[PDB]
Amino acid sequence: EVETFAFQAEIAQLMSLIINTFYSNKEIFLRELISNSSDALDKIRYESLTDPSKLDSGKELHINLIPNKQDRTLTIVDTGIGMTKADLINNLGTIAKSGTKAFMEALQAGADISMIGQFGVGFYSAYLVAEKVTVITKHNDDEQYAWESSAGGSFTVRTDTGEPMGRGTKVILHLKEDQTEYLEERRIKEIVKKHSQFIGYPITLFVEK
Numbered sequence: 503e504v505e506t507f508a509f510q511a512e513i514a515q516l517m518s519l520i521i522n523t524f525y526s527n528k529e530i531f532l533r534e535l536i537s538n539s540s541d542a543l544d545k546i547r548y549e550s551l552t553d554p555s556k557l558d559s560g561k562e563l564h565i566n567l568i569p570n571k572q573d574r575t576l577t578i579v580d581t582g583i584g585m586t587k588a589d590l591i592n593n594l595g596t597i598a599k600s601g602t603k604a605f606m607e608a609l610q611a612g613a614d615i616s617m618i619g620q621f622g623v624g625f626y627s628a629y630l631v632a633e634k635v636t637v638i639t640k641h642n643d644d645e646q647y648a649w650e651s652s653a654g655g656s657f658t659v660r661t662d663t664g665e666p667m668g669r670g671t672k673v674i675l676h677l678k679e680d681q682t683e684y685l686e687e688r689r690i691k692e693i694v695k696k697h698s699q700f701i702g703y704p705i706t707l708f709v710e711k
């Protein structure tokens with residue numbers, strides 16, 4: 503069963519802006535997504551200090567980077583707190599509404615896209631390089647869900663039936679045909695050693711057969 507939703511008007515506008523604006527420094531998407539995953543890991547770690555049973559769904563706190571040249575996908579896997587169905591449908595869009603509006607005022611005030619994470623909406627920078635984004639997430643207090651959107655004002659949420667994750671978030675970037683450089687090993691190594699050397703968790707780059 504798949505439910506389709508509409509993006510709240512403001513982030514429907516931000517996403518079209520990101521997709522349609524000619525902007526060459528597209529590599530900052532990896533910094534933001536890794537930065538988001540690091541925030542997700544910080545959250546589950548802080549909760550475990552007052553409740554070690556929260557790590558029963560997995561103790562390893564790390565981030566994995568998985569390119570796939572055949573499928574033309576770059577997957578980012580963290581073992582952070584994960585996300586609930588209310589997070590994917592309402593809660594985050596409500597916290598982001600002010601950041602989206604503020605980010606768009608700043609874009610006219612001279613600021614460029616690279617500062618998107620400063621407004622707490624850096625996840626949508628994925629659409630700089632991805633035509634479709636699929637998110638598999640698992641929170642301690644919810645089932646496993648699958649989130650997907652190809653921009654255009656709508657997204658879908660369904661109960662995932664594939665391989666269980668235990669706990670964490672998996673962001674699958676179905677890359678644009680001209681953005682395949684982000685599937686190359688030395689390119690990903692450069693972005694991580696230029697944008698995210700000071701992340702407090704291991705960042706493993708899965709290299710291909």
Ligand SMILES: Brc1cnc(-n2cccn2)nc1
Nearest residue numbers: 594595598622623625637649
């Ligand atoms: Br899936 C998914 C959906 N929305 C978001 N955000 C909204 C504002 C900031 N992040 N993150 C992940």
